Amino acid sequence: SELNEKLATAWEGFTKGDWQNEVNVRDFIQKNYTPYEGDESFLAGATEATTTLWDKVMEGVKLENRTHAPVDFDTAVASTITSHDAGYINKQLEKIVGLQTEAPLKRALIPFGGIKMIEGSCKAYNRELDPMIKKIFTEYRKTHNQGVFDVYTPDILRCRKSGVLTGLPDAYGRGRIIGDYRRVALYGIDYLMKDKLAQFTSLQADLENGVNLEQTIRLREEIAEQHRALGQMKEMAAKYGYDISGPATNAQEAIQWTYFGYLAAVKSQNGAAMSFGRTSTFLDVYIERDLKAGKITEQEAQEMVDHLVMKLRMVRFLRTPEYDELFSGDPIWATESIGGMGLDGRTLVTKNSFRFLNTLYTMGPSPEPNMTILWSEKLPLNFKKFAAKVSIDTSSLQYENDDLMRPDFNNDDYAIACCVSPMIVGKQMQFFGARANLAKTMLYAINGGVDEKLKMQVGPKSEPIKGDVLNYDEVMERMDHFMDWLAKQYITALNIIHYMHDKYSYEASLMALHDRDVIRTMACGIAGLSVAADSLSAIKYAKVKPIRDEDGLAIDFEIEGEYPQFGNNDPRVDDLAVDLVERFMKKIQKLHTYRDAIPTQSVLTITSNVVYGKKTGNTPDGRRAGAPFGPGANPMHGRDQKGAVASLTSVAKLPFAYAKDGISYTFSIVPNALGKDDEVRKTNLAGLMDGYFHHEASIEGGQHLNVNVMNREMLLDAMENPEKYPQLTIRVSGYAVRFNSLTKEQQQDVITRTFTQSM
């Protein structure tokens, strides 16, 4: 209850508030940020140090892209917060430092998740795993992977095998957790450790009194581990010559301190998505102070942000080839939520909001960080226009509905994890669940649980539907029951996973940057929505004839007549989609979950649209066997043939109320369809999004939107002349990737997607 010298000095000039007496980053931002409604004219360009540093790093990126393999990686060191010595690109040039290992782009071994994935990676890239590391993580330290497979059921293994429930977090970090790295800059490590000690002590009474004994013992051990992690963060920063016991005193230290918090996380956990948070405006408070005090020039501000962002562009994890198939493009999801509006009506847009976007110019286009615009119909027009402009120039940004999420949480400090999943920073997390195959689930309804490809009994043994024609009501009723079964197997698989993940790979350094009690949801994803929705339309508005095999197994279908397709704004096919989202949600919503994580859903697939597509046979909608599904909630490839306003209206109808974990939409529009010149395009793009995201009592609106502005012909050229587009970047499923980083097959999926020609 006394602010020492350290805090008063570091906070000189800052406006007072609860934030000075307790951990409350939101309050600090609310009382100190400077809303900015000006334009981009103040922006500086890169320095020589930035260009030199980035150009050198790109040599490693080019090497990664052409070999589709890591530049290098550890084979004899288990990665922890303090295991590696300091590594640099060029120590003399960097303003913000810190690498995962001792060298740029060298990937680490994070064994706590499973030694098998690591062995598989070593084999896939002709490297050899150290015998001791292998022995330790096989016989001495049990891993998340072995724990999950020691408890899985034979049914879950069958679903995994058949492609109905594949790619779940049983062989890679679950991620979906965002520690509030801003806390390190604002309070310094010692303060945070003191606060965790109080949290630990607060559990003593319940522990002694027998109140929820096991949950209390678990949380106390977790807090103890978090506290130990904070201490390791200091040792880690000291390796770089920094003392972070106290709070950041200037802009450089605020950025350096925040990043150090993130660095500890990417050094200790290999979560699928390791998001950064909502930091640009927070950091602007420190930059703004140094500028007014004349301690830094604007160009120096840009350089600091560029060096920070550059490090985020360098985060790497050793993954398996199977991982590569489910999550393509060497993704990191170092997501940053930019802008938004506060609850008080002010815009949370700052000059730093602009400096972050400006990295796409200072260092060229880049898939990471995953810059996400918190869009509001009330953002400054200067910012709305500049964002569209960056989109048109780079196809590197995504947009999410702040007018929808902010009121939903009734909070102006939530951030986006991975692609489209929101969480109040430092107070919420998700138990990541990948996604289930809804399309194949429909086929199981028609084939009595037998897999159309493996002729295996996977779903519960039922009577396959008989007849030369498929009746909507019959197929559907069956689909309903099979959805019940999918729900049960999915929830059970996740209960096991997260029980084991908490036990064998608890994200201590990230959780140390959260409140004592963290809200947890169990995010369940569904793949192939448009395939199943279209499949139900072709059945309900046309004539579908099952082409059965000698065992009476429907291995194909012939369609008589046209049927309405999702993405054209046709209520007939769009209502089936909306309903399907609602149907699965209510189902998982009844089931018991681990640690009482509240079930939620997301229409998101990442590269599963391809994986599940390959493992699913011909479907009622006319889609061929082994054909990629549409990304996330996207209408099937090329089916949304009525222009932009048409497809956006169809997707914008999907209910966020039954998919709180998010709804992904990858929208690609050719330049001329947006306008004759850039001023027209900027204005039209911003106008489209205003309408897509439009929100009111009677209109929920769209949740997310990836925006690619390009001509299909450019990619084809890129495919043949990769060395010509080293930094070409594109939105593919709720995140971006460098086109040259995808495989031939993954590019084939992209080049065959819809390229909106009209408005």
Ligand X SMILES: OC[C@H](O)[C@@H](O)CO
Q: Which does residue 688 bind out of ligand X, a copy of itself, Na ion, none, counting CB within 5 to 8 angstroms by kind?
A: Na ion
- Residue number, 325 or 403, with CB nearest to ligand X: 325
How far are the Cα atoms of 84, 110, 138 from residue 77, in angstroms, in the given order?
9, 9, 15
Site residues for a copy of itself, 70-89, by CB under 8 A, read: 78, 80
Report in angstroms how near the CB of residue 240 gets to a copy of itself at its nearest: 21
By CB under 5 A, the count of residues binding Na ion is: 13
Other CB atoms closer than 10 Å to residue 660's CB: what's the count? 22
Q: Given the DSSP bridges, would you call strands 729-731 and 736-738 parallel, antiparallel or unpaired?
A: antiparallel
**Rounded to an integer, what distance in angstroms lies between the CA atom of residue 657 and that of residue 634?**
18
Q: Could you say whether residue 235 binds a copy of itself (CB under 8 A)?
A: no
Q: Which does residue 134 bind out of ligand X, a copy of itself, Na ion, none, counting CB within 5 to 8 angstroms by kind?
A: none
Interface stretch with ligand X, choices 66-74, 274-282, 421-429, 630-638 (CB under 6 A): 66-74
Choose, by CB under 5 A, the member of 112, 354, 356, 482 that binds Na ion.
112
Report in angstroms how near the CB of residue 143 gets to ligand X at its nearest: 8
Q: Which does residue 220 bind out of ligand X, Na ion, a copy of itself, none, counting CB within 5 to 8 angstroms by kind?
A: a copy of itself
Q: Is 524 a catalytic residue?
A: no
> Dihedral of the CA atoms 573, 575, 581, 585 (nearest 10)?
-150
Catalytic residue, chosen from 122, 159, 418, 524, is 418
Q: Could you say whether residue 55 binds a copy of itself (CB under 8 A)?
A: no
Q: Could you say whether residue 139 binds ligand X (CB under 6 A)?
A: yes
Q: Could you say whether residue 150 binds a copy of itself (CB under 8 A)?
A: yes
**Rounded to an integer, what distance in angstroms lies between the CA atom of residue 489 and that of residue 437?**
12
Cis geometry, peptide bond prior to residue 35 (ω within 30 degrees of 0) = no
Q: Which long-range contacts (CB under 8 A, 24 or more apart) does 408-411 make?
A: 408/656, 408/660, 410/343, 411/26, 411/343
Q: Which does residue 70 bind out of Na ion, a copy of itself, ligand X, none, counting CB within 5 to 8 angstroms by kind?
A: ligand X
- Residue number, 80 or 359, with CB nearest to Na ion: 80
Q: What is the SS3 assignment for 315-383?
A: CCCCCCHHHHHHCCCCCCCCEEEEECECCCCCECCCHHHHHHHCHHHHCCCCCCCEEEEEECCCCCHHH
Q: Could you say whether residue 596 binds Na ion (CB under 5 A)?
A: no
Q: Could you say whether residue 167 binds ligand X (CB under 6 A)?
A: no
Structure tokens at 708: 């690619």
Report in angstroms how near the CB of residue 111 gets to a copy of itself at its nearest: 8
- Name where the chain breaks: residue before each gap, C-N > 2.5 Å: none
Choose, by CB under 5 A, the member of 531, 554, 688, 728 that binds Na ion.
688
Q: Could you say whether residue 496 binds a copy of itself (CB under 8 A)?
A: yes
Structure tokens at 485: 């079964």
Pick from 340, 480, 355, 362: nearest CA to 424? 340
Q: Which residues contact 259 (CB under 8 A, 6 or more apart)?
A: 96, 98, 181, 308, 311
Choose, by CB under 5 A, the member of 100, 199, 268, 729 that binds Na ion.
268
- Residue number, 653 or 738, with CB nearest to ligand X: 738
Contacts with a copy of itself, 108-127, as mask; x by CB under 8 A: ---x----------------
Contacts with ligand X, 730-759, as mask; x by CB under 6 A: -----------x------------------
By CB under 6 A, the count of residues binding ligand X is: 15
Choose, by CB under 8 A, the member of 3, 8, 76, 132 that binds a copy of itself.
132
- Residue number, 147 or 247, with CB nearest to ligand X: 147
Whether 81 contacts 509, CB under 8 Å = yes
Choose, by CB under 5 A, the member of 35, 671, 675, 687 that binds Na ion.
687
Q: Could you say whether residue 58 binds Na ion (CB under 5 A)?
A: yes
**Rounded to an integer, what distance in angstroms lies between the CA atom of residue 63 and that of residue 52?**
18
- Residue number, 324 or 412, with CB nearest to ligand X: 324
Q: Which long-range contacts (CB under 8 A, 24 or more apart) does 588-595 make?
A: 588/487, 588/490, 588/491, 588/522, 588/524, 591/487, 591/488, 591/491, 592/491, 592/495, 593/491, 593/494, 593/495, 593/522, 594/431, 594/494, 594/495, 594/498, 594/499, 594/522, 595/431, 595/498, 595/502, 595/520
Contacts with ligand X, 69-108, as mask; x by CB under 6 A: xx--------------------------------------
Other CB atoms closer than 10 Å to residue 305's CB: what's the count? 26
**Rounded to an integer, what distance in angstroms lies between the CA atom of residue 459 and that of residue 475?**
15
Backbone φ and ψ of 401, nearest 5°: -70, 95
> Dihedral of the CA atoms 399, 400, 402, 403 (nearest 10)?
100
Other CB atoms closer than 10 Å to residue 291's CB: what's the count? 17
Whether 28 contacts 285, CB under 8 Å = yes
- Residue number, 119 or 575, with CB nearest to ligand X: 119
Choose, by CB under 6 A, the member of 6, 31, 68, 134 that binds ligand X.
68
Q: Which does residue 687 bind out of a copy of itself, ligand X, Na ion, none, counting CB within 5 to 8 angstroms by kind?
A: Na ion
Pick from 276, 328, 222, 420: nearest CA to 742? 328
Three-state DSSP at 651 gives helix
- Residue number, 69 or 103, with CB nearest to ligand X: 69
**Rounded to an integer, what distance in angstroms lies between the CA atom of residue 616 and that of residue 628?**
9
Site residues for a copy of itself, 588-627, by CB under 8 A, read: 591-594
- Residue number, 81 or 156, with CB nearest to Na ion: 81
Q: Could you say whether residue 726 binds Na ion (CB under 5 A)?
A: yes
**Rounded to an integer, what distance in angstroms lies between the CA atom of residue 446 and that of residue 452?**
10
Interface stretch with Na ion, choices 6-14, 33-41, 597-605, 723-731 (CB under 5 A): 723-731
Q: Helices H, strands E: what count in the chain? A: 28, 17
- Residue number, 83 or 641, with CB nearest to a copy of itself: 83
Choose, by CB under 6 A, the member of 225, 377, 484, 515 that binds ligand X.
225
- Residue number, 590 or 624, with CB nearest to a copy of itself: 590
Other CB atoms closer than 10 Å to residue 292's CB: what's the count? 10
Q: Could you say whether residue 198 binds a copy of itself (CB under 8 A)?
A: no
Q: What is the contact surface with a copy of itself in residues (CB under 8 A)?
A: 78, 80, 111, 132, 136-137, 139-141, 147, 150-151, 153, 155, 204, 207-208, 210, 213-214, 217, 220-221, 224-225, 488-489, 491-492, 495-496, 499, 503, 591-594
- Active-site annotation, residues: 418-419
Q: What is the contact surface with Na ion in residues (CB under 5 A)?
A: 58, 80-81, 112, 214-215, 218, 268, 656, 687-688, 700, 726
Q: What is the contact surface with ligand X in residues (CB under 6 A)?
A: 64, 68-70, 139-140, 142, 146, 225, 228, 319, 324, 329-330, 741
